């Protein structure tokens, strides 16, 4: 019942069972400030059964510092009543309600309870009931640059998946009678001792196919031991082993019990003495609020700080904590007590939403139990922060001014950022910038570029779009939405529709890039990341990279002249398969899926293109005869798709589909078996079809079978779409037409003047002339995974399953086929929120212009296990050039537009280096091994003229610089690396 057209990306992270159990749980959220609304948004996007809000406090202006669903026309109204209407629109399957008053017994109606902005007495009263009644209780708080999370899921929490990784699977070479199991060649099982596994498709030991779990004894990286298998058999040949995961019982402690004896989680191992401080500090904050009518300490107040420190001392004495309090850190928490930032709110909201999903679905390992986080390193130091500058000014930025001050507010309001891409991370970044007031001054500006369009599956994690917006451009909708969120950004946002690449340099030129302040990437492909990184390096602009994958996420910051570039942080490459394995000898479902995709392309895409080009290019045949690798293939395809096998109705499409079935699943396998019989042996006497090669078996077309019928339907539908006919789905027509079918006789063949040319000419003169068919064009089939009615994924699934049946491989359903064929990247809304929070926390460091490299942090996290880590950026490598210190990345040579000979003389004299190679992009301008005549012809030419002549392309009018890569040798002959040259045209 799960709408796979909307939760397509989320299911690959959670699963069908997880979401099915999640859609039957009720969540109550107490408190509806920035953190509360963020949690509610993430939960609603997640897909819980319902959400209930409870916050009777009337709205105030400062509450807009982080609440993005509030407007200045709502001042004086309870936040819940004005937020429910806007929240109910995020997802149509998640009702949202509001309760006027909250009685304790009412709490029995819910499955999870989230508590924010609530005093300690109320937290204790709620927890004393939600603990013994087995209701999940999550309490979150965000004070300035500090945050706290507490989780309590009862005393008998059952966790099914403990790490979020798929079960370990592997292919078995053979199993002895002693229980020794070995994988295939150079294959690591990766198992540990004590695990449970099950065996399937094991030959010689059918008993092991039942699936009963067995102990695992790891004897090495490639072998392990399972015990004694004497009774079931003596030796097992081939088969597949799959790991079995056992549930874990976790017993939590109530809040009242865990106040005295807390259990901490350390988000960073470089500072592990702080969380004991924060545990005292937050309780002191609650006590101080209770002692002054709920009024937090004033910002940067010394009297309130002293009273707060006295309260901290009192609490430490009362709770018998043998910890030496840190006066500086406690007073810092006191100063920022009334702070409310949007980056911290977004980060903690993402974390708490993930915790709610863990509590509801009984999946992943939750926090146990306290999680105290701080980003105090983000506090600016180049501006004046004091009690006078941090006082509220009666504006919507008070929640931020109370932490950063008015001078830093002015610095923020004059930023000119550039966001590349408008995906989920782009939407979150735009929300954060709108809330922070980025580029709201006279000199501020924002530019966002993205060339994609909104799809239905994107609405699950991109909250700035709506179902009515499907089909429109992302950048325009995002700009309009964020202008609605913050009216001050009206006319301060520019949205482009251009793909960032080499061809867009005419728009994102030097004039555009010299006015920016920072660039933030929200891309999803490595090529664009590398290109943007190179451009930023050339222009020396700070860069913010961020990536997500399911529940994992990472954020990196690049600072000019200080840290290394994104290039060197390149990830390991991807996986591709040899042509030999795909063509003839597959052994996994991925191989069959790739083969099915190639078959689809070669059946419904390439012949159509050839026919269309023949009917468009006047001289196509002659060029293809002497250019195409297989002109005979092209001519035969044209003939078949024009005259020989042109369908006239749907019955002929069914006949053609049956013929293709026989041609691809029955005749090729017979030919392959004829070439390599099942009893054949290698040159060494070893059997051929052994190990990584599986003996295929021809398929006989059984109409009653489901897979055959699916393949026939899919092929007929695609052929009709290619010829623009009308397809049908009733089985009656298929059964009727395929009943009277006579398979043409087929036998394997051993093989054994200008006849070939005369054959080609005979094919050619049979083709109808191009003039006879004018305006007749065939529609190619462009692959589209997201559409469920285009018969693409159905065809791929059918072909993959049939080929798996050929080679005795386990077939896969449509879910796995769609995941593999489309290269879908799993994604989550919580990961997006967390990465956006981290990036925006680094942005305030970038604005302040911190110089030391120890003040920046690259972040990594994995929410499936509650892991967070932060490490300093890597410094840019240095080098010695002519006895001088040179940065390898952030240095360049600036030279005028001089002749090549003058450039060589300058490098020989000024730098004392001999130029041996000079290139501009992918063109070799000059080399020391070229013949003297060519050099003498090229030496007296200017650089621009030389480039134009070599590249056979005139320089564009907007071009203003040339980046030259030069390899030069020293006087002794030792190669020395030098930075690139920036020729100024």
């Amino acid at each position: 019942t799960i709408d796979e057209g909307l939760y397509s990306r989320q299911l690959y992270v959670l699963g069908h069972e997880a979401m099915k159990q999640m859609s039957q749980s009720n969540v109550l959220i107490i408190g509806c400030k920035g953190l509360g609304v963020e949690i509610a948004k993430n939960v609603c996007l997640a897909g819980v059964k319902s959400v209930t809000l409870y916050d009777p406090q009337p709205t105030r202006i400062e509450d807009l510092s982080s609440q993005y669903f509030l407007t200045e026309d709502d001042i004086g109204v309870p936040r819940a009543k004005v937020t429910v209407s806007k929240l109910a629109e995020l997802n149509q399957y998640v009702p949202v309600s509001v309760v006027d008053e909250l009685s304790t017994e009412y709490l029995k109606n819910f499955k999870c309870v989230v508590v924010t902005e609530t005093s300690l007495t109320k937290q204790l009263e709620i927890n004393d009931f939600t603990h013994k009644n087995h209701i999940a209780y999550i309490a979150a708080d965000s004070r300035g640059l500090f945050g706290s999370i507490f989780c309590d899921f009862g005393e008998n929490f059952i966790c099914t998946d403990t790490d979020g990784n798929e079960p370990l699977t592997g292919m078995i070479a053979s199993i002895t009678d002693d229980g020794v199991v070995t994988m295939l060649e150079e294959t690591r099982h990766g198992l540990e001792n004590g695990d449970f596994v099950k065996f399937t498709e094991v030959k010689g030991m059918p008993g092991l196919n039942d699936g009963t779990p067995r102990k695992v004894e790891v004897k090495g990286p490639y072998t392990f031991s399972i015990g004694s298998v004497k009774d079931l058999g003596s030796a097992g040949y081939n088969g597949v082993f799959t790991q079995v995961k056992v549930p874990t019982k976790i017993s939590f402690k109530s809040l009242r019990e865990s106040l005295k004896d807390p259990e901490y989680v350390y988000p960073d191992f470089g500072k592990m003495m702080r969380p004991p401080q924060y545990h005292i500090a937050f309780q002191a904050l609650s006590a101080f609020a209770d002692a002054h009518e709920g009024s937090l300490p004033r910002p940067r107040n010394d009297i309130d700080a002293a009273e707060f420190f006295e309260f901290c001392k009192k609490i430490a004495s009362t709770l018998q904590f043998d910890v030496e309090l840190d006066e500086k850190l406690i007073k810092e928490i006191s100063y920022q007590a009334r702070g409310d930032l949007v980056a911290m709110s977004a980060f903690l909201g993402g974390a708490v939403a993930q915790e709610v999903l863990k509590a509801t679905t009984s999946k992943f390992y939750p926090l146990k139990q306290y999680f105290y986080f701080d980003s105090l390193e983000s506090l600016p130091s180049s501006v004046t922060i004091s009690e006078e500058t941090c006082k509220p000014r009666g504006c919507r930025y008070d929640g931020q001014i109370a932490v950063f001050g008015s001078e830093f507010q002015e610095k923020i309001a004059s930023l000119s950022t550039f966001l590349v891409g408008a995906g989920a991370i782009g939407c979150e970044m735009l929300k954060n910038w709108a809330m922070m007031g980025v580029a709201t001054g006279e000199s501020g500006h924002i530019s966002v570029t993205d060339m994609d369009s909104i799809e239905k599956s994107n609405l699950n994690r991109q909250f700035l779009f709506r179902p009515r917006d499907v089909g429109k451009l992302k950048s325009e909708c995002a700009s309009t939405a964020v202008s609605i969120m913050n009216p001050s950004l009206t006319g301060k946002i520019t949205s482009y529709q251009e793909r960032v690449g080499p061809e867009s340099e005419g728009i994102f030129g030097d004039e555009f890039f010299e006015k920016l302040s920072l660039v933030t990437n929200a891309l999803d492909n490595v090529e664009a990341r590398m290109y943007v990184d190179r451009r930023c390096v050339f222009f020396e602009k700070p860069l913010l990279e961020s990536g997500t994958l399911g529940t994992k996420g990472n954020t990196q910051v690049v600072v000019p002249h200080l840290t290394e570039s994104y290039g060197s942080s390149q990830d390991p490459p991807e996986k591709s398969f040899p042509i030999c394995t795909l063509k003839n000898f597959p052994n996994r479902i991925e191989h069959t899926i790739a083969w099915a995709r190639d078959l689809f392309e070669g059946l419904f895409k390439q012949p159509i293109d050839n026919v269309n080009m023949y009917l468009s290019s006047p001289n196509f045949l002659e060029t293809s005869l002497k250019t195409s690798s297989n002109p005979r293939e092209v001519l035969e395809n044209i003939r078949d798709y024009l005259v020989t096998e042109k369908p006239l109705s749907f019955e002929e499409c069914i006949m053609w589909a049956r013929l293709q079935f026989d041609k691809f699943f029955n005749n090729n396998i017979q030919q392959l078996l004829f070439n390599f019989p099942k009893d054949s042996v290698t040159s060494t006497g070893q059997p051929f079809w052994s190990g990584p090669k599986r003996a295929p078996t021809p398929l006989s077309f059984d109409i009653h079978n489901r897979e055959h019928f699916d393949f026939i339907v899919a092929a007929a539908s695609l052929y009709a779409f290619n010829y623009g006919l009308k397809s049908e789905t009733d089985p009656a027509i298929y059964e009727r037409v395929l009943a009277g079918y006579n398979p043409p006789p087929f036998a394997p063949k051993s093989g054994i003047a200008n006849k070939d040319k005369q054959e080609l000419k005979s094919i050619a003169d049979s083709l109808p002339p191009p003039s006879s068919l004018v305006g007749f064009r065939l529609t190619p089939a462009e692959f589209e995974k997201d559409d469920d009615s285009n018969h693409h994924i159905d065809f791929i699934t059918a072909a993959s399953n049939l080929r798996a049946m050929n080679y005795d491989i386990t077939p896969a359903d449509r879910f796995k086929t769609k995941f593999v064929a489309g290269k879908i990247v799993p994604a989550m809304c919580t990961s997006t929120a967390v990465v956006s929070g981290l990036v925006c926390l680094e942005l305030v460091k970038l604005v302040d212009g911190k110089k030391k490299i120890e003040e920046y942090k690259n972040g990594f996290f994995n929410l499936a296990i509650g892991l967070f880590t932060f490490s300093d950026p890597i410094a840019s490598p240095k080098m010695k050039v002519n006895g001088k210190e040179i940065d390898k990345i952030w240095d360049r040579y600036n030279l005028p537009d001089c002749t090549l000979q003058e450039l060589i003389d300058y490098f020989q004299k000024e730098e004392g280096l001999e130029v041996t190679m000079l290139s501009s992009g992918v063109s070799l301008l000059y080399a020391n091994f070229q013949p003297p005549k060519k050099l003498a012809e090229r030496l007296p030419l200017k650089i621009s003229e030389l480039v134009e002549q070599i590249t056979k392309k005139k320089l564009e009018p907007f071009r203003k610089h040339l980046v030259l890569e030069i390899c030069c040798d020293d006087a002794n002959g030792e190669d020395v690396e030098v930075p690139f040259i920036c020729i100024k045209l």
Binding site: A173, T182, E185, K219, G685, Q686, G691
Partner: protein, 75 residues
């Protein structure tokens, strides 16, 4: 001494070796008897894969030990 090497197809080859013999010598014997290049021989004993450059004694191989032979084939 004598040892037995079992292949993936259930065959048992008997070899006359010494505890001090190197793995290279055993792979050479297996190539001489079955014609499998040493580079493609993966010999396993007691859950540990024998590596070139060492001796049988290094792996605690004693009288009438049993090894398993598999073949690593490229694409």
């Amino acid at each position: 001494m004598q040892i037995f090497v079992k292949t993936l197809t259930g065959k048992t080859i008997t070899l006359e070796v010494e505890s001090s013999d190197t793995i290279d010598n055993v792979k050479s014997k297996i190539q001489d008897k079955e014609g499998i290049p040493p580079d493609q021989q993966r010999l396993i004993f007691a859950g540990k894969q024998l590596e070139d450059g060492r001796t049988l004694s290094d792996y605690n191989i004693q009288k009438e030990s049993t090894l398993h032979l598999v073949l690593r084939l490229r694409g």
